[PDB]
């Protein structure tokens, strides 16, 4: 259970390589008992460990104009609302009530849906930089 013994086991199992054992012990300590660790090919000549805390999934923004911090090319929202729509969003008409309510509230909105069609995407992106609502999809 100690991290020293974990490092020793990882060192022995890797043909007596101390760095591998230290890296694996550190990764196990950081991730925890209930997490997962993965090994993949790198680019440089040294090993690196990247630990992701919280939830993250491999889907990006649906339109470049949603970016509000162009320095890093990323969309950052503070205290957002999350709309989880288990359906195809194609028409903006179904979204007027929630959009009006969010605009009244004054907090940003993030829409996670099956997909967004051009009409709704265009309406949302037009509303983004106009200063009415802050929306990403």
């Amino acid at each position: 259970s100690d991290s020293k013994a974990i490092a020793q086991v990882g060192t022995i199992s890797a043909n007596s390589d101390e760095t591998v054992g230290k890296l694996i012990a550190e990764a196990m300590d950081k991730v925890g008992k209930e997490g997962v660790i993965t090994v993949e090919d790198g680019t440089g000549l040294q090993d690196e460990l990247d630990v992701v805390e919280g939830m993250q999934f491999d889907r990006g923004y649906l339109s470049p104009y949603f970016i509000n911090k162009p320095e890093t090319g990323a969309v950052e929202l503070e205290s957002p609302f999350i709309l989880l729509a288990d359906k195809k969003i194609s028409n903006i008409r179904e979204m007027l009530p929630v959009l009006e309510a969010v605009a009244k509230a004054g907090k940003p909105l993030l829409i996670i849906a099956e997909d967004v069609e051009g009409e709704a995407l265009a309406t949302l992106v037009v509303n983004t930089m106009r200063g009415i609502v802050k929306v990403a999809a």
């Binding site: 028409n91 008409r93 959009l99 009006e100 309406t123 509303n127 106009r130 009415i132």
Partner: protein
Amino acid sequence: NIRPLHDRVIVKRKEVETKSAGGIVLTGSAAAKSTRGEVLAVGNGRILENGEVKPLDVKVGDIVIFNDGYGVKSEKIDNEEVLIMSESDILAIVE
């Protein structure tokens, strides 16, 4: 100056609304063409089968609700688009 014949009325539609019930701006196919207009000219009246003519109920200056169909014609008068339409297509008068 233009005036219609018989029971025809000339109307001009109002501009399509952008913001609807809030700051959300509608762009694209959602922003449908307005079905309200301003009457500019009024015909003398519809000719009855007997031969006499009765005046049209709509008067100049009113705001009317109508339906777009095959009977509504759009003409580019004096660099200002207006509609020539029959009185039967006028559904109601606002206020």
